[PDB]
Structure 1
């Protein structure tokens, strides 16, 4: 056999030398150099140190500034929240695991590690669908006099969680299961064994279709619409009203957010589809380790795109960090928001 199947795991190493141990009972240093596990640990340490403050700050500024209530401001607030669950929900265990070379917390630690990475990745995938919809409704404007309200945005947010939970929770209650991957310091969906006893195969097809292919189809089809209507081409203020030039900034960001999502999950998705379609083939530990741990960056890149591609939010963050206020130079050069500085309402 090319690997060592356990009743609870599947180590990507031969046990012909009888040196393979359950990833829930002993270190896996026989799979790789011990310094490489330290690498993983240092890496997770740094991700947590980056992920916590970046997402918390994003969360804090959105709340402290009353006028930050567009659908985009909601989705990113929702993302930072999801990202914080990733950091404290799963990254804390993946760091603890990497430090010991195996899941000392047994299957529970594996469920935490896998559930939160999945939840987070999916909340983002579905958040992209919503954003793609919202972006469609404002650019191609399917209605005549319509505008999304805080109510609709909260609906979208509630939606992403329902969809994400529909993908990450089944494995905690009998449909498929979370299992250690690569160097066995991270956990994911069981693509390794057929374990009919928990219907692993049907869940995988369900995950790749309902929670990967379909959403991407929607997203790319919707984009194909904003091919003619709007475009990445943006000049100075106006074009068709300054409300058009500013509307373009948000769309440019949403498109980048998709590029990033793909760059972060296509390799993990790719190696997972392979394994699933080559169960028992001869692949080693590093195979899934690299894409799996790289995908964990999904917990901090969104807020970075937000702050770097949204003049308004960035100015609000500066105003928050510089205490009282003092946005210096630009300030925004457009409408702004906060809790007492200049959140003055400006309708009619």
Structure 2
């Protein structure tokens, strides 16, 4: 083992020189210089200050305008709510932690940071499953109305909770990653008390691979077989591409670590993909404004 395992942490740094301290006890300056922690804090402050207004505006515009009741409108409203939980429930702890160089709030802080990021990302992924099904129904006509959209919304919360909640209560656990200022699922240690190995296989099969199979099955039908529907289909394509850009680096590094436990990697290895993935709280409403004329017009109408 090239790192330092403690009771509830795995630091990617050798303790041969005796300098490692728990990320719940002391700033982690032995593994990165203070200016690097400051860069994480500046980044998180930007995400909060952009993320709160843009998601709140999306929520407000949608509720105000009764014409915005297609399945796409409902799904984007649901994403705005999930994004606001990411920002206030998790990112406020990411910022405080990065400011101090360690999880001042202890494991409770780590649970908040990991839980709300996992929940938000999985609501986004299962939302893309709902939209892929909706597009496949509408275009291929093998009708998806408001009732189906609302049922789809409730479905995304149930699937997302089935991924994000077990590590709070004894199946796997949330543990600090990278420079130790964010938390994720424990890919690092076997920790039989929490049955870590079976949770990770469950997560990658049920909450990554199966959703992507459905999305690409639906897309294969669309491709390998009016103007308003085209606009929606084009936007969903970009939402799926943006999701893969956002999360594939994190998913690949996580799976690498899981299959190479204790190997020689350092704190920067997981820091960059883990913090890049937090853009997930901001980008979907940006796509929305650029790619949906009706929503953009309503937003301009309300804001002006």
Structure 1 residue 285 corresponds to structure 2 residue 267: yes
SS of equivalent to 2:249 = helix
1:151 CA drift (Å): 1.8
| Alignment partner, residue 43 of structure 1 | 43
| Alignment partner, residue 170 of structure 1 | 166
Q: Deviations over 1:80-119 (max 9, x none)?
A: 0000000001000000000000100000000000000000
Distance in 1 separating the partners of 2:133 and 2:163: 21
1:246 CA drift (Å): 1.1
| Alignment partner, residue 217 of structure 2 | 221
Structure 1 residue 267 corresponds to structure 2 residue 249: yes
Q: Deviations over 1:124-173 (max 9, x none)?
A: 0000000000011100011xxxx222221110000000000000000001
SS of equivalent to 1:77 = helix
Distance in 2 separating the partners of 1:262 and 1:314: 25
Structure 1 residue 247 corresponds to structure 2 residue 229: yes
Task: Structure 1: state its 5+ residue gaps.
Answer: 229-242, 322-348
Distance in 2 separating the partners of 1:253 and 1:126: 16
Q: Deviations over 1:329-348 (max 9, x none)?
A: xxxxxxxxxxxxxxxxxxxx
Q: Deviations over 1:189-221 (max 9, x none)?
A: 000000010000000000000000010011011
SS of equivalent to 1:226 = helix
Distance in 1 separating the partners of 2:87 and 2:30: 28
Distance in 1 separating the partners of 2:18 and 2:173: 26
Q: Which runs of 4+ in 1 moved over 3 A?
A: none
SS of equivalent to 1:179 = strand
Distance in 2 separating the partners of 1:264 and 1:293: 10
Q: Deviations over 1:28-62 (max 9, x none)?
A: 01111110000000000000001000000000000
SS of equivalent to 1:188 = strand
Distance in 2 separating the partners of 1:217 and 1:28: 40
SS of equivalent to 2:226 = helix
Distance in 2 separating the partners of 1:220 and 1:183: 35
Structure 1 residue 320 corresponds to structure 2 residue 295: no
Bigger Rg, which one:
1
- TM-score, structure 1 normalization: 0.86
Distance in 2 separating the partners of 1:151 and 1:18: 60
Q: Deviations over 1:304-344 (max 9, x none)?
A: 001100000000000000xxxxxxxxxxxxxxxxxxxxxxx
Distance in 2 separating the partners of 1:79 and 1:250: 16
Q: Deviations over 1:246-273 (max 9, x none)?
A: 1011001001000000000000000000
| Alignment partner, residue 340 of structure 1 | none
Task: Structure 2: state its 5+ residue gaps.
Answer: none
SS of equivalent to 2:223 = coil
What is the Cα-based RMSD across aligned positions, in Å?
1.2
1:245 CA drift (Å): 1.2
Higher helix share: 2
